Design a protein around this ligand. Structure first.
Ligand SMILES: *[C@@H]1O[C@H](CO)[C@@H](O)[C@H](O)[C@H]1NC(C)=O
Lengths: 199, 39
C-alpha cells in the first residue's frame, strides 16, 4: 500500500485557490524522498517537522491540498501570513504541521492570449479561519449601496480571474502548490515514511 | 468618499485586463485589497 501522491502532484487539472482541492491520504506508505527529489520544486518548506526526517515519521492522517496561485503569492501559503490569498483564499494555522510544495506551471497553466480559468477571491467581509474554504459567489457589498444580487456600484463579483499569459514575469506566472498536512491525533498512525520502523 | 474611489479603482483594474495588460490588472487587484483592508 503506497500513498498515491501522483494523483495530487502529477494531476492534470488543478483547482482554483478559493475552491482549493483536498485529498485524504491514509493507510499507505509514502516515500517523501521521491518528492524531495527535485521534480522541479521551487518551494518545499516544512513547519513543525524537518524535511529530511519525513521518511522516518508516521502520522495519524495526511491531508493533501492543491491549488494554483501567482508566484508572488506562494509566500502567503505559510503560517502567520497576510495578504489577498492568506486572508480570503487559503489560510494556514499558527501551529501548522506539514509541508508546502510549489513549482512553476507557466508551461501548463498559461495559454497564448491569457489563461483566465483560475480564480481568486478578492472581496470578503472577514478573514478566513485556518483551513476554511469559501466557495460562495454572492455579490459583495463594499459600500452602503444594497446590491440586490447584481453587480453595480460598489457591488462586485467576489471572484477575480488571474491573467496568466506566458509573457508574464515569474511573479505573475501561475504556480501549482501542494500543501501536505501531517495530523498527529490520539490515534494509531496510518501514514508512515518509507524508512519508519513500521511504527 | 471611499465608495466612489473604490469604484473607479475597480473599473481601472477591469479595463486594464480588457486591454491585455494582465500584469497591471493583477497589480491593481493587489492594491484594491490593501486599500479596502485599511482597518
Ligand atoms: C510524476 O511522474 C514523473 C514521471 O516519471 C515521476 O518522475 C514523478 O515521481 C511522479 N510524481 C509523483 C508524485 O508521482
Amino acid at each position: 500500500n503506497l500513498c498515491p501522491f501522483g494523483e495530487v502532484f502529477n494531476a492534470t487539472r488543478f483547482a482554483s485557490v478559493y475552491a482549493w482541492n483536498r485529498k485524504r491520504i491514509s493507510n499507505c506508505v509514502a516515500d517523501y524522498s521521491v518528492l524531495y527529489n527535485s521534480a522541479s520544486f521551487s518551494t518545499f518548506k516544512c513547519y513543525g517537522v524537518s524535511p529530511t526526517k519525513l521518511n522516518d515519521l508516521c502520522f495519524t492522517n495526511v491531508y493533501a491540498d492543491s491549488f494554483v496561485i501567482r508566484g508572488d503569492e506562494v509566500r502567503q501559503i505559510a503560517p502567520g501570513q497576510t495578504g489577498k490569498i492568506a486572508d480570503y483564499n487559503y489560510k494556514l494555522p499558527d501551529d501548522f504541521t506539514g509541508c508546502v510544495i510549489a513549482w512553476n506551471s507557466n508551461n501548463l497553466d498559461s495559454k497564448v492570449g491569457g489563461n483566465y480559468n483560475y480564480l481568486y477571491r478578492l472581496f470578503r467581509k472577514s478573514n478566513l479561519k485556518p483551513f476554511e474554504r469559501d466557495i460562495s459567489t454572492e455579490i459583495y457589498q463594499a459600500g452602503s449601496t444594497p446590491c440586490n444580487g447584481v453587480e453595480g456600484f460598489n457591488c462586485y463579483f467576489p471572484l477575480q480571474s488571474y491573467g496568466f499569459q506566458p509573457t508574464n514575469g515569474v511573479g505573475y506566472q501561475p504556480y501549482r502548490v501542494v500543501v501536505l498536512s501531517f495530523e498527529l491525533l490520539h490515534a494509531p498512525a496510518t501514514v508512515c515514511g518509507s524508512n519508519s520502523e513500521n511504527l | 468618499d471611499k465608495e466612489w474611489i473604490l469604484q473607479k479603482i475597480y473599473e481601472i483594474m477591469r479595463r486594464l485586463d480588457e486591454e491585455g495588460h494582465a500584469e497591471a490588472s493583477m497589480r491593481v487587484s493587489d492594491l484594491i485589497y490593501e486599500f479596502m483592508k485599511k482597518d
